[PDB]
What does this fold into?
Amino acid sequence: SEPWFFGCISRSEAVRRLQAEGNATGAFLIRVSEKPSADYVLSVRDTQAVRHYKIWRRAGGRLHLNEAVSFLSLPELVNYHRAQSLSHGLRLAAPCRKHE
It folds into this structure.
């Protein structure tokens, strides 16, 4: 259990990160919303390609990638993502590995 918060990785680094051979499906990372505003985006290799998601906060202390997945905080929000694959093509697992 570890997403690896990285708010300094473009949609390119993440795409090549999750897809990389450092994750056997399930990898997930929490970066910053390069497109959105004051939020965080998560990317998971799922089971092959790279899937991203926008994490909208409840302005106060609660992140939710959807209207059916909200959590006081990020670390907690993920915990549920791992167990429930609802808003996720593949229940999270380990942190997105890279090459360095």
About this structure: The CA atoms of residues 16 and 83 lie 25 Å apart.
